[PDB]
Amino acid sequence: PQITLWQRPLVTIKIGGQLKEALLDTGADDTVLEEMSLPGRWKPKMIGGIGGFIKVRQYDQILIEICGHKAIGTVLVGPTPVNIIGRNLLTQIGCTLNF
Amino acid sequence: PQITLWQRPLVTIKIGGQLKEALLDTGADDTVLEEMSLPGRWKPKMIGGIGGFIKVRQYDQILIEICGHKAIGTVLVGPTPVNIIGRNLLTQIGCTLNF
Numbered sequence: 167p168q169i170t171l172w173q174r175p176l177v178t179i180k181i182g183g184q185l186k187e188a189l190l191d192t193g194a195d196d197t198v199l200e201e202m203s204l205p206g207r208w209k210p211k212m213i214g215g216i217g218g219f220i221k222v223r224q225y226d227q228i229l230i231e232i233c234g235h236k237a238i239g240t241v242l243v244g245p246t247p248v249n250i251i252g253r254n255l256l257t258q259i260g261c262t263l264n265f
Numbered sequence: 266p267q268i269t270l271w272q273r274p275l276v277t278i279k280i281g282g283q284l285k286e287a288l289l290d291t292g293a294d295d296t297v298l299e300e301m302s303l304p305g306r307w308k309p310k311m312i313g314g315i316g317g318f319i320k321v322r323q324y325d326q327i328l329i330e331i332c333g334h335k336a337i338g339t340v341l342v343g344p345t346p347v348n349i350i351g352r353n354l355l356t357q358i359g360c361t362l363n364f
């Protein structure tokens with residue numbers, strides 16, 4: 167698709183057999199989802215944005231479907247205000263910025 | 266241009282006759298630039314990022330030059346680590362997300 171930016175670019179993702187809403191976010195290096203339980207072991211990570219750092223949980227090789235495009239990649243879990251799809255998974259599903 | 270997302274999407278902007286580098290951020294609602302002096306009076310605002318809220322100064326009716334293209338709109342100035350061009354100005358230059 168082509169998504170213009172007058173509204174937030176929210177798409178629907180499927181992860182863990184659930185459907186969630188997430189923001190497509192070119193300003194985010196990584197993908198962070200709200201507090202959920204995902205399979206397997208986790209490592210620790212701190213990510214910093216505006217307002218400071220949060221401590222999140224890094225899971226690897228997670229399957230997540232964005233607009234019916236399957237990506238398998240690293241997903242962070244933590245107290246983020248919105249689910250954010252960031253560059254590590256945007257590159258996978260072939261996403262560019264155009265003007 | 267067609268900007269890919271293997272690296273951060275940094276481009277050159279011009280505001281107040283200064284050249285700056287800044288991030289094309291589809292996840293940002295507003296444009297937030299690093300502490301600098303602008304023409305006009307400002308309203309104060311609280312905007313919230315990933316690690317919580319910061320206080321910014323809001324200037325209206327500001328022209329920025331992004332890769333040639335002019336855009337005018339609200340610009341917030343405040344303690345941000347990186348310069349961020351959000352949706353409010355991304356729309357004016359005709360920016361879209363394509364996959």
Ligand SMILES: CC(C)(C)NC(=O)[C@@H]1CN(Cc2cccnc2)CCN1C[C@@H](O)C[C@@H](Cc1ccccc1)C(=O)N[C@H]1c2ccccc2C[C@H]1O
Pocket residue numbers: 191192193194195196197198213214215216247248250252288290291292293294295296297312313314315346347349351
């Ligand atoms: C207006 C303003 C700019 C303040 N907006 C944001 O910060 C929004 C906030 N919401 C939330 C919100 C807050 C309040 C109200 N509604 C919504 C969540 C997403 N962001 C958008 C982010 O794209 C902003 C960037 C800024 C940045 C980039 C690089 C380095 C430092 C800062 C961001 O936070 N990116 C970071 C990031 C993000 C996720 C995972 C890893 C990493 C690393 C890093 O790239």
